Structure formats: C-alpha cells, structure tokens
Design a protein around this motif. Structure first.
Motif, PDB file in Angstrom:
ATOM      1  N   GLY A  20       0.775  -1.240   0.000  1.00 60.55           N
ATOM      2  CA  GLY A  20       0.000   0.000   0.000  1.00 60.55           C
ATOM      3  C   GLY A  20       0.800   1.280   0.000  1.00 60.55           C
ATOM      4  N   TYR A  21       1.784   1.393   0.893  1.00 60.26           N
ATOM      5  CA  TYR A  21       2.629   2.578   0.980  1.00 60.26           C
ATOM      6  C   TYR A  21       3.891   2.461   0.135  1.00 60.26           C
ATOM      7  CZ  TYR A  21       5.520  -0.038   4.310  1.00 60.26           C
ATOM      8  OH  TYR A  21       6.332  -0.971   4.911  1.00 60.26           O
ATOM      9  N   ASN A  22       3.857   1.655  -0.930  1.00 62.28           N
ATOM     10  CA  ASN A  22       5.003   1.562  -1.828  1.00 62.28           C
ATOM     11  C   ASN A  22       5.309   2.903  -2.483  1.00 62.28           C
ATOM     12  OD1 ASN A  22       7.041   0.569  -3.562  1.00 62.28           O
ATOM     13  ND2 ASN A  22       5.525   0.083  -5.142  1.00 62.28           N
ATOM     14  N   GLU A  23       4.287   3.708  -2.733  1.00 61.17           N
ATOM     15  CA  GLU A  23       4.432   5.051  -3.266  1.00 61.17           C
ATOM     16  C   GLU A  23       4.201   6.080  -2.168  1.00 61.17           C
ATOM     17  OE1 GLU A  23       1.920   2.968  -5.634  1.00 61.17           O
ATOM     18  OE2 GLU A  23       3.949   2.130  -5.588  1.00 61.17           O
ATOM     19  N   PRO A  24       4.733   7.294  -2.323  1.00 58.62           N
ATOM     20  CA  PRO A  24       4.474   8.338  -1.325  1.00 58.62           C
ATOM     21  C   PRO A  24       2.984   8.610  -1.183  1.00 58.62           C
ATOM     22  CG  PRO A  24       6.285   8.977  -2.746  1.00 58.62           C
ATOM     23  CD  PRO A  24       5.706   7.728  -3.339  1.00 58.62           C
ATOM     24  N   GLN A  25       2.561   8.868   0.050  1.00 55.84           N
ATOM     25  CA  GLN A  25       1.153   9.030   0.380  1.00 55.84           C
ATOM     26  C   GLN A  25       0.865  10.466   0.799  1.00 55.84           C
ATOM     27  OE1 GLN A  25      -1.288   6.163   0.719  1.00 55.84           O
ATOM     28  NE2 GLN A  25       0.231   5.127  -0.566  1.00 55.84           N
ATOM     29  N   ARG A  26      -0.289  10.973   0.376  1.00 54.96           N
ATOM     30  CA  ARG A  26      -0.734  12.323   0.688  1.00 54.96           C
ATOM     31  C   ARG A  26      -2.008  12.256   1.517  1.00 54.96           C
ATOM     32  NH1 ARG A  26       1.481  11.997  -3.917  1.00 54.96           N
ATOM     33  NH2 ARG A  26      -0.431  11.182  -4.876  1.00 54.96           N
ATOM     34  N   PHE A  27      -2.169  13.211   2.429  1.00 56.98           N
ATOM     35  CA  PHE A  27      -3.286  13.219   3.362  1.00 56.98           C
ATOM     36  C   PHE A  27      -3.981  14.572   3.348  1.00 56.98           C
ATOM     37  CE2 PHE A  27      -2.449   9.186   5.384  1.00 56.98           C
ATOM     38  CZ  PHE A  27      -1.103   8.998   5.162  1.00 56.98           C
ATOM     39  N   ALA A  28      -5.307  14.544   3.461  1.00 59.74           N
ATOM     40  CA  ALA A  28      -6.123  15.747   3.498  1.00 59.74           C
ATOM     41  C   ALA A  28      -7.091  15.659   4.668  1.00 59.74           C
ATOM     42  CB  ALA A  28      -6.892  15.938   2.188  1.00 59.74           C
ATOM     43  N   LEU A  29      -7.102  16.694   5.501  1.00 64.67           N
ATOM     44  CA  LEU A  29      -8.010  16.780   6.633  1.00 64.67           C
ATOM     45  C   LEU A  29      -9.289  17.490   6.211  1.00 64.67           C
ATOM     46  CD1 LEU A  29      -8.840  16.606   9.599  1.00 64.67           C
ATOM     47  CD2 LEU A  29      -7.512  18.683  10.015  1.00 64.67           C
ATOM     48  N   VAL A  30     -10.429  16.904   6.579  1.00 66.02           N
ATOM     49  CA  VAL A  30     -11.749  17.438   6.272  1.00 66.02           C
ATOM     50  C   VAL A  30     -12.556  17.488   7.561  1.00 66.02           C
ATOM     51  CG1 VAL A  30     -11.870  16.825   3.840  1.00 66.02           C
ATOM     52  CG2 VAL A  30     -12.412  15.117   5.570  1.00 66.02           C
ATOM     53  N   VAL A  31     -13.289  18.581   7.763  1.00 65.35           N
ATOM     54  CA  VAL A  31     -14.113  18.774   8.951  1.00 65.35           C
ATOM     55  C   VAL A  31     -15.541  19.059   8.509  1.00 65.35           C
ATOM     56  CG1 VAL A  31     -14.361  19.970  11.144  1.00 65.35           C
ATOM     57  CG2 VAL A  31     -12.100  19.738  10.107  1.00 65.35           C
TER      58      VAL A  31
END
Lengths: 51, 51
Positions: A20-31
């Motif tokens: 799963g994390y073989n590639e760089p991972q990006r994260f977005a916070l939503v409220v």
C-alpha cells in the motif's frame, strides 16, 4: 490534531510490493459540522427568519 | 488553629461577574419574505396592441 508514526513513515514510500505505501502518500483533513436552523412558511413563501 | 481540612463544604462557588473576552456583535441578516421573487404565472396577461 496530531499525526501518528505509522502515518509519518507511510508518507514516505519505499515499501515492498503489496504493502500500500510503496508510493508516497498524501493526506487531506476534512471537517464537517451539523447545526440547527428555523424555516418559516407563510402565504406560499419560504425563508429564514434568522439565517 | 481551628482550621480542619476534612469538611467537604465546597462553599457555593464564585459569581462570573464578567468574561475576559468581550463577545463581538454581528449584523443581523434576514432572508426571503412574502414577496421573495417566486414563480406563480397565474395570468400571463394579454397585452392588446394599440397600433
């Protein structure tokens, strides 16, 4: 909010295949927020008395 | 010293006379009213040509 060590290490890739994390991972916070309101109906007209 | 510590008498509390931070007053914004630009097309009228 505070991130986790697993998240901070999975952000950088390099993991083996089928991980799963073989590639760089990006994260977005939503409220999301849920609130109340009042709708006034009169003589075939709708509006917010307070809005 | 007539100063025992056992009595759980926690008094009544303390009156919050004021708050450290004043609450700003926002401008009230109402919404639609009885004539809130609604479609009803009852008549569609009939303008006879004068000439």
């Amino acid at each position: 909010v505070t991130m986790s060590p697993e998240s901070v290490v999975a952000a950088a890739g390099g993991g083996n295949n089928n991980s799963g994390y073989n590639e760089p991972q990006r994260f977005a916070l939503v409220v999301i927020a849920v609130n109340h309101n009042v709708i006034r109906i009169m003589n075939g007209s709708m509006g917010f008395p307070i809005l | 010293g007539a100063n025992p510590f056992r009595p759980p008498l926690a008094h009544q509390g303390l009156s919050k006379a004021h708050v450290v931070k004043t609450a700003v007053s926002v401008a009230n914004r109402s919404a639609g009213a009885e004539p809130f630009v609604t479609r009803n097309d009852p008549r569609a009228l009939a303008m006879e040509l004068a000439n």
